[PDB]
Amino acid sequence: ENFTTNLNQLARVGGIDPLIGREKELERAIQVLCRRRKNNPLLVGESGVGKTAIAEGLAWRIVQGDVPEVMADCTIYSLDIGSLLAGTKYRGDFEKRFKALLKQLEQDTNSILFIDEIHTIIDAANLIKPLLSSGKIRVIGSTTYQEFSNIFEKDRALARRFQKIDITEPSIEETVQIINGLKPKYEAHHDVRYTAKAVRAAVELAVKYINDRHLPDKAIDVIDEAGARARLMPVSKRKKTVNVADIESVVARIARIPEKSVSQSDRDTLKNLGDRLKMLVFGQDKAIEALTEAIKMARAGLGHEHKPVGSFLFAGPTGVGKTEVTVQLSKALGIELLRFDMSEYMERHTVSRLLTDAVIKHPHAVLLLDEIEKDVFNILLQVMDNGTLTDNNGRKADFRNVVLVMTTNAGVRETENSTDAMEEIKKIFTPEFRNRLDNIIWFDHLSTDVIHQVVDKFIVELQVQLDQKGVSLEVSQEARNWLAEKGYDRAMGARPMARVIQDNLKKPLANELLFGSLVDGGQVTVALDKEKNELTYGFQS
Amino acid sequence: FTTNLNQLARVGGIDPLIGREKELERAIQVLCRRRKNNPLLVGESGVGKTAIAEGLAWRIVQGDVPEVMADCTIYSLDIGSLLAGTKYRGDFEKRFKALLKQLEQDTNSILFIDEIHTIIGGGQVDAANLIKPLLSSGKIRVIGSTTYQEFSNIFEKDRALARRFQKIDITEPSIEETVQIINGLKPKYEAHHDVRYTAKAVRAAVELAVKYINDRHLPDKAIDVIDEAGARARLMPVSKRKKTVNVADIESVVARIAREKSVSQSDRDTLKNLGDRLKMLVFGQDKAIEALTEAIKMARAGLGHEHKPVGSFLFAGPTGVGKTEVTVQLSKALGIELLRFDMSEYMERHTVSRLIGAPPGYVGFDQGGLLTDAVIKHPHAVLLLDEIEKAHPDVFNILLQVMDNGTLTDNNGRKADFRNVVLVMTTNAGVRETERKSIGLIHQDNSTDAMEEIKKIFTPEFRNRLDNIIWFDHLSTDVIHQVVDKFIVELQVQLDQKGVSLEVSQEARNWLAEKGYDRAMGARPMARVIQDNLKKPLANELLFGSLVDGGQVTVALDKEKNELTYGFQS
Amino acid sequence: VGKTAIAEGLAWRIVQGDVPEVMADCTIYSLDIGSLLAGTKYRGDFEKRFKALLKQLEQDTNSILFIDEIHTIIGAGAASGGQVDAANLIKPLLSSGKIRVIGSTTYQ
Amino acid sequence: GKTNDWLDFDQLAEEKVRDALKPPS
Numbered sequence A: 001e002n003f004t005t006n007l008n009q010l011a012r013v014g015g016i017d018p019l020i021g022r023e024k025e026l027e028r029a030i031q032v033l034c035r036r037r038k039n040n041p042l043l044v045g046e047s048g049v050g051k052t053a054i055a056e057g058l059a060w061r062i063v064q065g066d067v068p069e070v071m072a073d074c075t076i077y078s079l080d081i082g083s084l085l086a087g088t089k090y091r092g093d094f095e096k097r098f099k100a101l102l103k104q105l106e107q108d109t110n111s112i113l114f115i116d117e118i119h120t121i122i123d124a125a126n127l128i129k130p131l132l133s134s135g136k137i138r139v140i141g142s143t144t145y146q147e148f149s150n151i152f153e154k155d156r157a158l159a160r161r162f163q164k165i166d167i168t169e170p171s172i173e174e175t176v177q178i179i180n181g182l183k184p185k186y187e188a189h190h191d192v193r194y195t196a197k198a199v200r201a202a203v204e205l206a207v208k209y210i211n212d213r214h215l216p217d218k219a220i221d222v223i224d225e226a227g228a229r230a231r232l233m234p235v236s237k238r239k240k241t242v243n244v245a246d247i248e249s250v251v252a253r254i255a256r257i258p259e260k261s262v263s264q265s266d267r268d269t270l271k272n273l274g275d276r277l278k279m280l281v282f283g284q285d286k287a288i289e290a291l292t293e294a295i296k297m298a299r300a301g302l303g304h305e306h307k308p309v310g311s312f313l314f315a316g317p318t319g320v321g322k323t324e325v326t327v328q329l330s331k332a333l334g335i336e337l338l339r340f341d342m343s344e345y346m347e348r349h350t351v352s353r354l355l356t357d358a359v360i361k362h363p364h365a366v367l368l369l370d371e372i373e374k375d376v377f378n379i380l381l382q383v384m385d386n387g388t389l390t391d392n393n394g395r396k397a398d399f400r401n402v403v404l405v406m407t408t409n410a411g412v413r414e415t416e417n418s419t420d421a422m423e424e425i426k427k428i429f430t431p432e433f434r435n436r437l438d439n440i441i442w443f444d445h446l447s448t449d450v451i452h453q454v455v456d457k458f459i460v461e462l463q464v465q466l467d468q469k470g471v472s473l474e475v476s477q478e479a480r481n482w483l484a485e486k487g488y489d490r491a492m493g494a495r496p497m498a499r500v501i502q503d504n505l506k507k508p509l510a511n512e513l514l515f516g517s518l519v520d521g522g523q524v525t526v527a528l529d530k531e532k533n534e535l536t537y538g539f540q541s
Numbered sequence B: 001f002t003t004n005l006n007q008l009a010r011v012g013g014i015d016p017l018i019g020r021e022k023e024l025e026r027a028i029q030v031l032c033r034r035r036k037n038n039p040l041l042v043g044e045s046g047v048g049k050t051a052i053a054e055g056l057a058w059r060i061v062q063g064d065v066p067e068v069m070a071d072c073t074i075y076s077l078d079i080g081s082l083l084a085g086t087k088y089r090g091d092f093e094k095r096f097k098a099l100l101k102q103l104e105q106d107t108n109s110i111l112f113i114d115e116i117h118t119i120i121g122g123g124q125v126d127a128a129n130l131i132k133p134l135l136s137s138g139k140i141r142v143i144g145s146t147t148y149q150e151f152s153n154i155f156e157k158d159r160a161l162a163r164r165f166q167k168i169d170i171t172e173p174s175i176e177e178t179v180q181i182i183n184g185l186k187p188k189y190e191a192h193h194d195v196r197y198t199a200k201a202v203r204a205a206v207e208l209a210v211k212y213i214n215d216r217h218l219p220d221k222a223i224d225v226i227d228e229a230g231a232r233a234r235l236m237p238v239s240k241r242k243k244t245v246n247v248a249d250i251e252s253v254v255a256r257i258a259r260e261k262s263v264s265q266s267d268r269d270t271l272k273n274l275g276d277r278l279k280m281l282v283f284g285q286d287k288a289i290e291a292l293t294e295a296i297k298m299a300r301a302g303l304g305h306e307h308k309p310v311g312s313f314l315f316a317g318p319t320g321v322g323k324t325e326v327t328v329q330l331s332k333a334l335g336i337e338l339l340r341f342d343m344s345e346y347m348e349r350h351t352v353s354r355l356i357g358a359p360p361g362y363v364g365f366d367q368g369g370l371l372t373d374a375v376i377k378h379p380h381a382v383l384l385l386d387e388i389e390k391a392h393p394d395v396f397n398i399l400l401q402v403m404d405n406g407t408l409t410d411n412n413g414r415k416a417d418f419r420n421v422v423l424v425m426t427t428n429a430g431v432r433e434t435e436r437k438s439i440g441l442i443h444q445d446n447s448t449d450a451m452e453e454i455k456k457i458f459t460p461e462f463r464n465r466l467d468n469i470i471w472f473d474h475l476s477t478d479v480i481h482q483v484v485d486k487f488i489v490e491l492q493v494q495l496d497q498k499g500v501s502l503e504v505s506q507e508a509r510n511w512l513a514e515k516g517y518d519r520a521m522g523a524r525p526m527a528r529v530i531q532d533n534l535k536k537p538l539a540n541e542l543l544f545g546s547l548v549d550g551g552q553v554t555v556a557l558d559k560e561k562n563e564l565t566y567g568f569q570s
Numbered sequence C: 001v002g003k004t005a006i007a008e009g010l011a012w013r014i015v016q017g018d019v020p021e022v023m024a025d026c027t028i029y030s031l032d033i034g035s036l037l038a039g040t041k042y043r044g045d046f047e048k049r050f051k052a053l054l055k056q057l058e059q060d061t062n063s064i065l066f067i068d069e070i071h072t073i074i075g076a077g078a079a080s081g082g083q084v085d086a087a088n089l090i091k092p093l094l095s096s097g098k099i100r101v102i103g104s105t106t107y108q
Numbered sequence D: 001g002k003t004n005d006w007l008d009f010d011q012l013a014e015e016k017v018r019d020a021l022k023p024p025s
């Protein structure tokens, strides 16, 4: 009796959340109870408190009745596995108490015993098997899907005994009626007024931005919290005014995203994507303009769904502003970006998959395929035609709302008299890929003036770091050119320029701090002479 | 068994809370709600979560909280005393109901149970877990405090108490907040220790704690570092009982416990002659020694990534170039323990368990990870990973993590720090060479391209993380002469132990070097030639000859016969 | 390595007098886990004996107890039901800091 | 042909527990 709760009797007066809807879903729940044998209704899926709502909801139905008189008379119970798994300090104590429960539970042969998170037991689990086959006590066990599949399906006494009741995620439009049924109940819960249209504006982040909280779970704790925060924030002033603005504050801090993004800024963000992208990454004016045009069409989602949302293909040597955009591209959007180079991930472990559980929680994953140029192109053909990615379940790919950014570095690697960059892409790629490709952007040549600004970025990080120490570095523009002359190579682009300041310059400077002319200095007389085209290092105090 | 926080606030015993305004509002917000009324503070050890729970109670007296909260009173559960105060059973249940009866009578009042994780998982512990959610029913509010590790195990499995509770994230306080918060407890230590702390002294503590003691959170660690500093003045100065202490002693304690700025003369010559000291031992590798020493110097100066290790190097070269020798000698000169690992053994995917420990509950789980335990025991070490290419690609994933953040978690979950470890690896990607030279009357240097093999075997992202990939060139003929001298010295040391003194003429050394000099084989054949010509005759004499007692040996070469002549006198 | 020599050695230095004045007068002790368990047949004997020793340390305010192999007290004598381990009994006193106890254990 | 993949057999430690009695008086 310590672990028994009378949901049916307790709900007579009330106190249970009424989950309107799901009427057809609950028909199976009653159809199982009417079976002579194997009448064990099991609800499988995944959610937090929401998953048990199908069971907790069924408690209200038993009270309400409106079912056959024979089936109408019944009662349900619930036990917490965790309550009996704490303080035991030994193995097998939980099972002993499980059997002892029958001494008081065995009063009639028509009743159910709800279980929560039964996956943990299957925590000896030996005694669970015989109690099932007895059938004197019905069982309803909430549990996830992936873990439940590994253990329950392989068993025999468990799978046959239960009657799997699968659950699905409601659609975007279906989600409106998820909170509509609970809108009056929530009004009574807090006794504060809430904006009716605001509920429809609370699904902006729940649908795809988080991917960690289900739609019913998100709705229950977002509208109630918004009303509570607005109600309790002004202590002196009593106000019942709630709106989308109030929801932004609650979502912003938990989701750790800008407040503006939670607002109805979808139109403004698209217009602002152009200038915002330019702000983060310097240069690439021509490429960025074509880039945002593709992203503009990608966010539309009012055209061919089978085709991928976008195929951004670049042709530039490494380190010339191509792999840099990758960071800025995702930073502005705010979504996590994957990095799975095709050449590095061509193993059987991952090539067949086309890195097991992370990929599902990625609404907009900008896959990066470095060195793709140097059977890899054929593999990508199916992705474009049908947008299908192999997985355990075998569902369709997420390319409807996911983009793949593949980068090519074959313009100069082939030769150095050499052909233009557009010649290598034609021969290396497959004919179907080239024709289906939406468009081609080129990063072969990086503006002269833009290169100088990128160099200053790294120098600023070094200069500000040195200022903290108590010294001032003065990298004259003449010296900066040297940094970009050696760092830039036509064969390998400007990739060696990334670390050309941590070895050619950061190494001598450090020696001076430890032991040398002056442990604490500054006023570095940086200059380049014409004797051997090399840098100069000098300073005094 | 219980304490009235309202009375304690009036008395002034509890320290006034400083900062954490954002955390308090979020806690009170969930607490006020009809449902999800039991706030839970998730925070690591010493972050401040416990102070926040008591700080809210003190705020009630001030009146800055809502007027409705004024009715609320906080009570602390003395879990330790309750467990001891029992004879047969039921003691906890009877007293807890009476306390909760007051809480139920006055729904406003709250019950702050510290270390809520302890309640859930002898006899009383079983009852205490169930007593909380069933009797409370979700109406009676209760505050909790459990760490991230405990929150996952204790609350995720049951899900009954978790639904009633509502977590409130916690973050490390800012540097500015840390000095403000420590001021509240600073008067207590000065009185007991009879010391005075300058404003600059407390400023140094926060910065030193994060750089050297980053493993332990800054707020609680800040309290601990200043406590030791006070004790130092009480006990460290034997005479004059010197009060009025400053940053200098603060550096003396934080740096010593962590185990530094203001480089001493000994430390200066350790790094100043590191390159020249390693050139004497290993010849013909000036380019490699300078590059390795320069990176190490950058870390001491501090011009490097904080989270990443001091340096990552890959020594790829032909056999007998002393790539591994420079690693072993570096440890000797630096005085840092050499954690030498052989990757040939770790050539299977299952062998990764030896690196990061076996799964929990296994027969070999007690042993634990071989890399995590070793680095923890010796934080400053030289992690030599020989023949990395031989190992399975799975280890490279682990190494990528160390390079990016210098951290690695085992099955136990302990966090290791590789910031002070100079990671070094060796490979033999290009040892293979084209034995077939130019097919012509005269030979040509058709040697295979350098660094081409390394690129194929190792992925590009792995190479980028490495600070530098130092290629070792084949030893020159002049270099071989120097190598013979060190080997001759080693032979002399062995002979000295037996009482034998050996003198080798300069002409003899040149003859041995020429006979045993092979560019492809490296410097290892020189030892073999020395062993065949010098050690073999001496060993026979040492056992069955004059050298048994001890003697003087002089080695010369006959020009006519082009062979070494050994003279034994004894 | 010498951890035991460092604890026991501290006692030798104290009698010699080459130590700080604060620690010049400290009655170091050496708890024996096996000795306590010898007479714990009856219920409550462990608590009575352990509490008695702990009381002596706090009232003195200078006595220091060197308890080697601190891992042993984690799972000390607990016949059944009470589960009153030595660590549980000593946990509150250590938190207050009235009694200071030196410990020595292997890395494993 | 094709490569040959080997599969390991995990072994989990298992233990029992003894009991110690205590006369009340």
Ligand SMILES: Nc1ncnc2c1ncn2[C@@H]1O[C@H](COP(=O)(O)OP(=O)(O)OP(O)(O)=S)[C@@H](O)[C@H]1O
Pocket (backbone or CB within 6 Å): B015, B016, B017, B018, B019, B020, B044, B045, B046, B047, B048, B049, B050, B051, B052, B055, B181, B184, B185, B219, B220, B223
């Ligand atoms: N925000 C704060 N404002 C004022 N004082 C604080 C604050 N946070 C911590 N302190 C002080 O620092 C002490 C130690 O930190 P606590 O928060 O009590 O530790 P803890 O988080 O319970 O960690 P343990 O001790 O490892 S369980 C507190 O008791 C206060 O004296």
Ligand SMILES: Nc1ncnc2c1ncn2[C@@H]1O[C@H](COP(=O)(O)OP(=O)(O)OP(O)(O)=S)[C@@H](O)[C@H]1O
Pocket (backbone or CB within 6 Å): B281, B282, B283, B284, B285, B317, B318, B319, B320, B321, B322, B323, B324, B325, B326, B426, B475, B483, B523, B524
């Ligand atoms: N450049 C060198 N200077 C001095 N001694 C050297 C040099 N190269 C090799 N030796 C000696 O020859 C041996 C080299 O052993 P290791 O350091 O293991 O060589 P290694 O080059 O790492 O071997 P590989 O390439 O892995 S087979 C030691 O006895 C060294 O003292």
Ligand SMILES: Nc1ncnc2c1ncn2[C@@H]1O[C@H](COP(=O)(O)OP(=O)(O)OP(O)(O)=S)[C@@H](O)[C@H]1O
Pocket (backbone or CB within 6 Å): C001, C002, C003, C004, C005, C104, C106
């Ligand atoms: N620094 C030292 N000064 C004097 N004697 C020492 C020192 N270090 C070790 N010894 C002696 O060598 C012994 C080594 O064993 P212990 O130090 O007792 O072992 P331990 O370090 O406590 O480790 P275990 O694993 O617990 S035996 C000491 O007990 C002393 O007799």
Ligand SMILES: [Mg+2]
Pocket (backbone or CB within 6 Å): B323, B324, B386, B426
């Ligand atoms: Mg080697």
Ligand SMILES: [Mg+2]
Pocket (backbone or CB within 6 Å): C004
């Ligand atoms: Mg010992």
